[PDB]
Amino acid sequence: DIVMTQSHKFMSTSVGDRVSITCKASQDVSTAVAWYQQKPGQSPKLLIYSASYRYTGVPDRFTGSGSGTDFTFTISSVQAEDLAVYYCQQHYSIPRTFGGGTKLEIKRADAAPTVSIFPPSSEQLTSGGASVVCFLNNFYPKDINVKWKIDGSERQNGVLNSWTDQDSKDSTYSMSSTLTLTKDEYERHNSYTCEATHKTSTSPIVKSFNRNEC
Amino acid sequence: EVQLQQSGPELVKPGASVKISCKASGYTFTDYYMNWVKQSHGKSLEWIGNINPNNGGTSYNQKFKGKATLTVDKSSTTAYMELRSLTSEDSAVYYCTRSPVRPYYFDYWGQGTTLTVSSAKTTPPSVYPLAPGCGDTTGSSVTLGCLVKGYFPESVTVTWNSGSLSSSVHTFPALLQSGLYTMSSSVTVPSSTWPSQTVTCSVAHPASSTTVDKKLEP
Amino acid sequence: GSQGERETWGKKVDFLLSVIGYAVDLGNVWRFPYICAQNGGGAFLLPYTIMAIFGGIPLFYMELALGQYHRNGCISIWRKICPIFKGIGYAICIIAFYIASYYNTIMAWALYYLISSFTDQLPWTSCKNSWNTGNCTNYFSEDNITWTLHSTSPAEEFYTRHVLQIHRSKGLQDLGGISWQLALCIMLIFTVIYFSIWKGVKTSGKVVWVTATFPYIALSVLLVRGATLPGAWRGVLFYLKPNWQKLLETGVWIDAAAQIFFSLGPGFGVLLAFASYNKFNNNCYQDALVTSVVNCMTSFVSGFVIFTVLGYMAEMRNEDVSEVAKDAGPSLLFITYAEAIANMPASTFFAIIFFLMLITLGLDSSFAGLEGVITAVLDEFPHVWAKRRERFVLAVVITCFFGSLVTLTFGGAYVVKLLEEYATGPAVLTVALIEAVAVSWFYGITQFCRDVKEMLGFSPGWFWRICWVAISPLFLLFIIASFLMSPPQLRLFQYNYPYWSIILGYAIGTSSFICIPTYIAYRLIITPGTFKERIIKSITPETP
Ligand SMILES: CC(C)CCC[C@@H](C)[C@H]1CC[C@H]2[C@@H]3CC=C4C[C@@H](O)CC[C@]4(C)[C@H]3CC[C@]12C
Ligand SMILES: COCCCC/C(=N\OCCN)c1ccc(C(F)(F)F)cc1
Ligand SMILES: *[C@@H]1O[C@H](CO)[C@@H](O)[C@H](O)[C@H]1NC(C)=O
Ligand SMILES: *[C@@H]1O[C@H](CO)[C@@H](O)[C@H](O)[C@H]1NC(C)=O
Ligand SMILES: [Cl-]
Ligand code: NA
Ligand code: NA
């Protein structure tokens, strides 16, 4: 069989930069390499075939080069909608194998994480639970600290951080920190507070609310 | 034009079998090879095998020989892939993709089929609204949201007002714990449409076939 | 008085090239490279020699010794060894007739391909012809093309729909009628073989000078041509890449054994007849050794001749020579290799020498093929025959023409496959086993070594005695058992043979050797007295 090796699992680039992904094969391939694009949440999309040739319905900004074992897929003008995972695949010998995949992350300026705290709704208090939610929207880069405060004490149990994938419009990450608690404990505390520490500013953003019917 | 419609998500117990369909349209079906590519969660693409639609001329991969069985029906132009002896490794997203004979590229793909091989009971999602408090300062935009707790498997869809408008909806990936998933969604809408009009979040669960709709109330 | 002694050959080199010319044929050119590439690559060289040293060479040498010592035909030699086995001499005869029903038609194709190569523009380059369909897509045409399941190439279109015309038949059921073109071609072939046999071994010994030396020249030209072609290393790599994991499979050993048996060709009566006409004090050991070793070397260089061109073809397309060399048949030469030649400078030249090479590859083997049968029949019915040789030779050539009419049909290729794999093969292996058993275990291997000790002046080594006694009969037994245990499922040109095809193959196969058991029963049923006295006078050679 054939082993298509992509050394760089992740590559950083900016909107408008020249980005190139390399693909290493086991044996000599001549010009039998295809480049596929898989957007997060979508099916793969064919972009390049036979080393350099472009497929119908592909913008001119996507190019291809290489002749032998090492091949290169080049994007000249990176757009916001070009954010996807790229795969290379040989099409000469049976079986047809694929590469590891290179998630192309976009580098931009820093962004302030909009923090929003939310009190447990009445439908959940009806079921017999109560979860305070702390959303962190539109920030960059991915690295960001989330600290919880039930009533001033740093809460650490029952906190779940969920990071979404990068955005395809403005390239800003978003995460959700969830504090899941019981109803009995929720009706014994009033003002919840979640704070977030980012690199845009040294002072963590602090959000608070009261249980006494807001 | 060229459309490949596969089957929906499948939740099957380990050791059983599952069949995935593939309805083709927009091209001469007897002209192109029909393929099946397996994509694991967080992994790469994995060519399973092809099949010749004229006679069912199958050509499997050595890694999937005896694992997948490809069939085809010319009367309705529909391909099938069946998987037997299901384990945890088979829980992945499967595609059926069109391909010529030479050069052997995959020009058109299907939307995929999320397969979950587990014995866990299909749990209906608990939809709890995530409404902003009544003491917050209503600025130029308010951030709303809905919460989904306890469901299995990863087959859920959280929509907002029949898809209008959704220019600021953030959907957070589900997190699995104690055999149940839990996710959340939010939406930043201006203060000139709330709470004047009706903003209702819809939570659908195709695995359990349960659609619970909850309207946000401050 | 009258005839008395028989004639003898003109020169040592004539018989050395006649046997080499019979040994070297199409299969050396294309069967050995394909089976060598797909069964371990270069590692196939190891069992091919082992199956030669232990199986092929002993039968080849033992057959050439019996022939050069006893100087009898394929039939009359059994009367002087084991009369009950005289049916062997007849069986081979029938076998030959089946082979001759198709092996010549094949040459006809090459001939029809050769006489059509005198045009400045080769027919299988363009698609604007009277036989191409709308699927015909050729080169020197817009780039970016992408091949479709129904699309075909002008070469594939030219072989399938023009010369072979296999689309006019629905299979073995409906194949008629006969194509008059290939009938005239195969008539021309039966004429160029007629004037090379009718005079006896003199003309087949004069014509062999050309038929045995031309293929090496043509192979040399194609070799130095294909070696200069860019990307020819891929075919050589796929040809020689060692895959030692294939040797663990019990199949490649059987493939090597069968390949070296049919390539060496003992047991057919050809070596018996060719050896019959020779000097009594002439050496036989060196002759057999050299001839076989050339037959293998020739296969070895032919492998390069094919795989350099197929490597170039894989480079022009997109690699994996297995993809371009999937079909293992005449299509590898008439379609793949031909389409590759068409895309080269002086295409007319390399086409003429290629098809001409094929014809000269076939001719020497059909010469010998007939020589053995003619010698056998003339020696079994002497002075009832030999009244003229031209009469019998003509009756054979004409009989083969009428016997090839089934192959000259539109669905002729189907009959070719059926006869080549289900009929002749297992029967030649069988009669070779019967002959090897009769000579080794009935006539006595000790007396055989004494006869060689009389002719050549020295007794054969222990290596050869131990080979004839045990190694060779097990060598044939392995191939026969392997085939009978699992006959291969036949498929040709997107047409799977019906399930009853093997019955027809076995029917044709069984009708060939009804004579050895019915003749054993015949002679066993004719001689009076007790069965012990009849089998004692039937196993021991005639006393005077
Ligand atoms: C040469 C002689 C002795 C061989 C005869 C053997 C007979 C029994 C064999 C030879 C050819 C065979 C036939 C080949 C063709 C067909 C047509 C098919 O639609 C039904 C099977 C059938 C009818 C086969 C039946 C068996 C068969 C008739
Ligand atoms: C069953 O087909 C294999 C034939 C083997 C003997 C042979 N040619 O092989 C040459 C050895 N490399 C052969 C046999 C018969 C004839 C005949 F002239 F009789 F048709 C021609 C060639
Ligand atoms: C090659 O073929 C396709 C037809 O399927 C065509 O649409 C395309 O434009 C051609 N050219 C390239 C550069 O892909
Ligand atoms: C091409 O071939 C297919 C089958 O191989 C056939 O159905 C079709 O009619 C052919 N096209 C033309 C134009 O004849
Ligand atoms: Cl050989
Ligand atoms: Na040979
Ligand atoms: Na020959």
Question: Could you give a quick summary of the protein structure above?
Answer:
Chain B: Residues 125-217 form the Ig-like domain. Chain B: Zn(2+) binds at residue 170. The complex is a heterotrimer of chains A (214), B (218) and C (544). Chain B has 218 residues and is an all-beta fold.
What would you note in describing this structure?
- The complex is a heterotrimer of chains A (214), B (218) and C (544).
- With 214 residues, chain A is mainly β.
- Chain A has 2 domains: 1-108, Immunoglobulin-like (Sandwich); 109-211, Immunoglobulins (Immunoglobulin-like, Sandwich).
- Chain A is 5% helix and 44% strand.
- Chain A contains 2 helices and 17 strands.
- In chain A, the strands form 4 sheets. A 6-stranded mixed beta sheet of chain A has the order 1-9-8-3-4-5, with no helix packed on it. A 4-stranded antiparallel beta sheet of chain A has the order 10-11-15-14.
- In chain A, a hairpin with a 4-residue loop joins strand 12 and strand 13 (154-155).
- The longest helix of chain A is centred in the middle third of the chain and has 6 residues, at 122-127.
- Chain A is elongated and about 70 Å long.
- Chain B is mainly beta.
- In chain B, the strands form 4 sheets. Chain B has a 6-stranded mixed beta sheet, with no helix packed on it. Chain B has a 4-stranded antiparallel beta sheet with strand order 1-3-8-7, with no helix packed on it.
- Chain B folds into 2 domains: 1-119, no CATH class; 120-215, Immunoglobulin-like (Sandwich), CATH 2.60.40.10.
- Chain B is elongated and about 70 Å long.
- Chain C is mainly alpha-helical and 544 residues long.
- Chain C has one domain (1-544).
- Chain C is 65% helix and 0% strand.
- The longest helix of chain C has 34 residues, at 347-380.
- At the A-B interface, strand 4, strand 10, helix 1, strand 11 and strand 14 of A face strand 5, strand 11, strand 12, strand 14 and strand 15 of B.
- One 2-acetamido-2-deoxy-beta-D-glucopyranose binds next to strand 5 of chain A.
